Design a protein around this ligand. Structure first.
Ligand SMILES: [Mg+2]
Ligand SMILES: [Mg+2]
Ligand SMILES: [Mg+2]
Ligand SMILES: [Mg+2]
Ligand SMILES: [Mg+2]
Ligand SMILES: [Mg+2]
Ligand SMILES: [Mg+2]
Ligand SMILES: [Mg+2]
Ligand SMILES: [Mg+2]
Ligand SMILES: [Mg+2]
Ligand SMILES: [Mg+2]
Ligand SMILES: [Mg+2]
Length: 51
RNA sequence: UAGCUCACUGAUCGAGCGCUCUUGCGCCGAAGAUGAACGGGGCUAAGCGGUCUGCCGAAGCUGUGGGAUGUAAAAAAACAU
């Protein structure tokens, strides 16, 4: 069972997130955002990586 | 010739009715050659007028980002394109 666990792993349990979602306006489009997830948008002018 | 019948009149019946226009929408006039042939299915509105209010609808206008050309002679920032 150590071998058969190594080579055929069981699906791990899902990471915890809050049960919540929002609908937010960015660059005049509306996205549904759930926390922990990344989305694509219009360039935000004057935004730097790690902001 | 006769004969039938009409115009007109008396009577009966008891509440409307005559001849005129004129709008709107229809009917007939209207019939071809490969096969519904007029978008289709269908609809008495899901057709036609008139009025009220919602919505859909484009590469138009707005929103958020990039480019370029002209001002213009470095940029950057404007405006226009
Ligand atoms: Mg006769
Ligand atoms: Mg025929
Ligand atoms: Mg039709
Ligand atoms: Mg109408
Ligand atoms: Mg459009
Ligand atoms: Mg285009
Ligand atoms: Mg375009
Ligand atoms: Mg335009
Ligand atoms: Mg622009
Ligand atoms: Mg330029
Ligand atoms: Mg220029
Ligand atoms: Mg120049």
């Amino acid at each position: 069972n150590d071998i058969i666990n190594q080579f055929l792993p069981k699906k791990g349990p899902p990471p915890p997130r809050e049960e919540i979602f929002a609908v937010v306006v960015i660059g005049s489009r509306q996205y549904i955002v759930i926390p922990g997830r990344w989305i694509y948008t219009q360039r935000l002018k004057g935004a730097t990586v790690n902001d």
